[PDB]
Design a protein around this ligand. Structure first.
Ligand SMILES: *C/C=C(C)/C=C/C=C(C)/C=C/C1=C(C)CCCC1(C)C
Length: 137
């Protein structure tokens, strides 16, 4: 549907706790939380093909996928992984990830477009769920 847009963050909950589960030490967690306050998501959607560009003040990364096809990206804490996105309803998709090398927490994310025009992202590591809410620029 209309995931396409330039999204700007308005709320971020449990992000520090997510990073803690992921092994990031406290000073870097605090700096990462501060960096999440500037952060923007740009989405281009055509059918079930998505282009996503995530950017903060000094860093930017692009994610390209088709729903239902495995692709490679990185976990939140930077460990490369294989990902697979599926729809869960009209305007929510869920991505499951598997580490390429090694072991670690089970991670995943979801992206939802609400009826009131917000984008909700969740990122999960084991039992900890980070929720971020965006509005269009
Ligand atoms: C569909 C939207 C997705 C998959 C968004 C992914 C977002 C990230 C991988 C954000 C990561 C960040 C850090 C790892 C620390 C700096 C702040 C963030 C939130 C940009």
């Amino acid at each position: 549907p209309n995931f396409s847009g330039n999204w700007k963050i308005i709320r971020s909950e449990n992000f520090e706790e997510l990073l803690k589960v992921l092994g990031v030490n406290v000073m870097l967690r605090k700096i990462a939380v501060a960096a999440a306050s500037k952060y923007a998501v740009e989405i281009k959607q055509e059918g079930d093909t998505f282009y996503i560009k995530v950017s903060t003040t000094v860093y930017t990364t692009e994610i390209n996928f088709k729903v239902g096809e495995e692709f490679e990206e990185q976990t939140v804490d930077g460990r490369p992984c294989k990902s697979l996105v599926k729809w869960e309803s009209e305007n929510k998709m869920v991505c499951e990830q598997k580490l390429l090398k090694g072991e670690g927490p089970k991670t995943s994310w979801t992206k939802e477009l609400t009826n009131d025009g917000e984008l909700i992202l969740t990122m999960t590591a084991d039992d900890v769920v980070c929720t971020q809410v965006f509005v269009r620029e």
